Design a protein around this ligand. Structure first.
Ligand SMILES: CN1CCN(c2ccc3[nH]c(-c4c(N)c5c(F)cccc5[nH]c4=O)nc3c2)CC1
Length: 277
């Protein structure tokens, strides 16, 4: 319950998992101070203890500081309270006592959304699948908005994809700690993060989806961007994109946070487009 680093972390019966049952695998995500690794967790579903399931395992090597563990413990404790949703990297279990810390979270087979879209390019990927991707993140963000979480940056890299193409958001639970293009004006300059600063980032995320995993603000040094944003100039409507759907991106990129749309509206707007196709 919001506890810091200790010699041995406290036992929590609602979330604890047997480390002898968990079997680690090859490294999924290279990381500097902490890392995420693949693992075949046996008996993850306790109703069927014989059958196994593939899972991700966030952890840290012998080098991360005392503060770096407290971040991972804070990331764990936030995931407990937020609970389950279809479009979120949910917590499955934790291994704390009598050994190193392993936080078990559900695995994503097809990787991040940027690498997913860039792979499936025409030298697959239809229009409704792109709208289905944009709709699922909006639903996922709406749930995290209602639980008072507030996402840090939000981008194609941070959203992950399942075997059956379900968009699941990751790193929502991580505390504060490069992504200049994705940040809102108030988040860049004054550093005041709100629900409406993620709305800006969702606008940038919509751009990434309908450019098939393109890099936003193409061909600038991350300096004229600042002057460009505060002179009434935003990104253009990309190749193959409707004007009403582009209108939602322009709504997100309004300078006034009050003028930007809430996540409830962006779901309901995309719902009408998803219901059409
Ligand atoms: C060599 N190529 C490296 C990139 N390839 C890849 C493919 C699927 C992947 N899933 C995750 C992953 C996370 N990064 C993750 C996280 F960062 C936090 C919480 C849960 C997570 N679950 C994941 O499943 N990484 C992947 C990498 C393909 C092979």
């Amino acid at each position: 319950s919001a506890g810091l680093v200790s010699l041995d972390l406290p036992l929590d019966p609602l979330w604890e998992f047997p480390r002898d049952r968990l079997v680690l695998g090859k490294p999924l995500g290279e990381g500097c101070f902490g890392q995420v690794v693949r693992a075949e967790a046996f008996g993850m579903d306790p109703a069927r203890p014989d059958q196994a399931s593939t899972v991700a395992v966030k952890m840290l090597k012998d080098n991360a500081s005392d503060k770096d563990l407290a971040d991972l413990v804070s990331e764990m404790e936030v995931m407990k309270l937020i609970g389950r949703h279809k479009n979120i990297i949910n917590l499955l279990g934790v291994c704390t006592q009598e050994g190193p810390l392993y936080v078990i979270v559900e695995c994503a087979a097809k990787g991040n959304l940027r690498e997913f879209l860039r792979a499936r390019r025409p030298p697959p990927l239809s229009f409704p699948v792109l709208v289905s991707c944009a709709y699922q993140v909006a639903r996922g963000m709406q749930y995290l908005e209602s639980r008072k979480c507030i996402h840090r940056d939000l981008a194609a890299r941070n959203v992950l994809v399942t075997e059956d193409n379900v968009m699941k958001i990751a790193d929502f639970g991580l505390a504060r700690g490069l992504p200049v293009k994705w940040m809102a004006p108030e988040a860049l300059f004054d550093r005041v993060y709100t629900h409406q600063s993620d709305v800006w980032s969702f606008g940038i995320l919509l751009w990434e989806i309908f450019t098939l995993g393109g890099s936003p603000y193409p061909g600038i040094p991350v300096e004229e961007l600042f002057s460009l944003l505060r002179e009434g100039h935003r990104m253009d409507r990309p190749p193959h994109c409707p004007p009403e759907l582009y209108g939602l991106m322009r709504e997100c990129w309004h300078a006034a946070p009050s003028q930007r749309p809430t996540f409830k509206q962006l779901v309901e707007a995309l719902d009408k487009v998803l219901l059409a196709v």
